[PDB]
Nucleic acid binder design. Sequence first.
DNA 1: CGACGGATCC
DNA 2: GCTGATGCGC
DNA 3: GGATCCGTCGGGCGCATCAGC
Length: 276
Amino acid sequence: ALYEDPPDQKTSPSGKPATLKICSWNVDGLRAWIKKKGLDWVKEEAPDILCLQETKCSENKLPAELQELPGLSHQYWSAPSDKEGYSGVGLLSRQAPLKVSYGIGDEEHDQEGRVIVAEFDSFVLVTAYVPDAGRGLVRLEYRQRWDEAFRKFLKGLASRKPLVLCGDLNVAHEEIDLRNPKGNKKNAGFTPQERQGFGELLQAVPLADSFRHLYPNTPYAYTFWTYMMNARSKNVGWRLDYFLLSHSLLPALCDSKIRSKALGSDHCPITLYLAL
DNA sequence: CGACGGATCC
DNA sequence: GCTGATGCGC
DNA sequence: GGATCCGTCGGGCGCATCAGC
């Protein structure tokens, strides 16, 4: 069945106005995403913080339009040291973070430009392109170790301000998070190993799924669709993109959106509204 | 990884 | 510089 | 035999390299 994201709730449960909008988007090729008119959707969306994943683009090769967004002038980029054309993350902010760091503090996992940490006054933001388990599950065991190191890095993130984890976590937590869970329990992103790791992220850090807290039984809500067999036209997809938040932030949670109409990638943009 | 084809199931 | 084959990873 | 279970195949994209010119 198709999916129409409910209208934006730009007010919290206590009637407080959204002071912060964050947009996360796996662009599957930032230079391609821009030629495909992706920055135009960002302009219309006017986010305060824009997190991008799978940039596939080093810093010296970023298109000049990216350095022309005035409401997103604070830009921070991370790419693999060896694999050019692979992975890559980005954080564009209206206001300068107090602190910007890269990696989960672990050499085995900090080589593929997958994590940017940005400390703001009231919260700590973390964008992530989590390792894929791969065709045939070749990189599953690596994903399992990444999960362990990520869980630990996040739980002890130095200080005590709430956490907003955003990005491509590369798993569909439960069966409601993908069209075909039965034929994908042995396919990357639906292995029980990965699904349990997400569960442990939630219990250990701890964190909550913004979208699922608001929409616990909303089906067909996906963020990724294979380009193959035009899976997007039939909404056969997976929710791999999320905003996970400390429970301290749930009183500030106005909404968590899925922008199913925005094109440019095999992923759709997600958006969080927060009243801080 | 969605689609498909074969195998099995009551 | 520019394109197309080839390879690799989603 | 309609419905379900499950393994195999073939394929959309982006970007890198390299050759040729």
